[PDB]
Write a protein that binds this DNA or RNA. Structure first.
Ligand SMILES: [Zn+2]
Length: 259
DNA sequence: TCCAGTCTACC
DNA sequence: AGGTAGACCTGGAC
């Protein structure tokens, strides 16, 4: 999932687990990194006081420590209310249940197991995976002035820089492809060759694209302008969308509307 | 057959 | 260092 889906996941679990208290934790497997056995002993009786998100990580907080959950490329987190009989029917990819004092179940699912469930004891801001991340794309800190300045010593394709978590978090393959198209910029443009006006447009397109996706999250449908539309018509010029490989990632764009 | 986040590793 | 590729693993689309 990318940042819209993680933010929508966050907004879905929080009203369902925050005030509540953990009673058991089921571990049908133990991902990219190993899970901690006796996580149930760790969390039993501990109230949730907050959930949160940083980059594509979810954060479940207690007074004793922080649970970090990453969905990777195919992970899901879902709530089952006590009356929901799907509690009794987990599939082979439903690796973890987090069961609350009231019967509510939070279920983590992840077929390829690229996600992570990690338990951490110290200061949130110092976690090794969160410490060196760049700014939030929907924060004031991700501005045209920062971006133009961060990009001056980078010769690399701007798509690489825009997908770099040290430059800005959360802009994955889909929304980097869509923002670069909507801003009119080739993904192959050297990052330091974006003009200041172009970095201001790319910034506001990222913010707009990501925000609309957070709210959105037989008949003709088309979510995307270029992503996953190899060899189909560009919605602006009608020309064919090309797909290339840039930084090991599928890169879709129109060479006519993007320079 | 090949397509679909990020930590590690080498020149 | 910056730039590259490999590593993880499983399901579904031509
Ligand atoms: Zn076009």
């Amino acid at each position: 999932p990318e940042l819209p889906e993680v933010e929508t996941t966050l907004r879905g679990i929080a009203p369902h687990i925050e005030g509540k208290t953990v009673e058991a934790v089921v571990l049908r497997q133990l991902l990219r990194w190993q899970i901690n056995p006796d996580l149930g002993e760790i969390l039993s009786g501990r109230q949730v006081l907050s959930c949160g998100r940083r980059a594509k990580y979810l954060l479940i907080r207690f007074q004793t420590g922080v649970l970090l959950i990453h969905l990777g490329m195919s992970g899901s987190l879902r709530i089952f209310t006590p009356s929901d009989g799907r509690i009794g029917r987990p599939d082979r990819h439903d690796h973890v249940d987090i069961v609350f004092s009231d019967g509510t179940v939070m279920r983590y699912r992840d077929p390829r197991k690229f996600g992570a469930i990690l338990w951490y004891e110290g200061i949130e801001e110092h976690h090794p995976l969160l410490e060196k991340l760049g700014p939030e794309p929907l924060s004031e800190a991700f501005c045209a002035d920062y971006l133009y300045a961060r990009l001056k010593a980078q010769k690399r394709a701007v798509k690489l820089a825009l997908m770099d978590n040290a430059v800005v978090v959360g802009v994955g393959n889909i929304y980097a492809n869509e923002s670069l198209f909507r801003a009119g910029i080739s993904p192959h443009r050297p990052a330091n060759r974006l003009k200041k006006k172009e970095c201001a447009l790319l910034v506001e397109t990222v913010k707009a694209v990501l925000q609309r996706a957070i709210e959105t999250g037989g008949y003709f449908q088309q979510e995307y302008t270029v992503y996953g539309r190899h060899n189909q018509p560009c919605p602006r010029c009608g020309g064919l969308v090309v797909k290339e490989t840039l930084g090991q990632r599928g890169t879709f764009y129109c060479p006519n509307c993007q320079k």
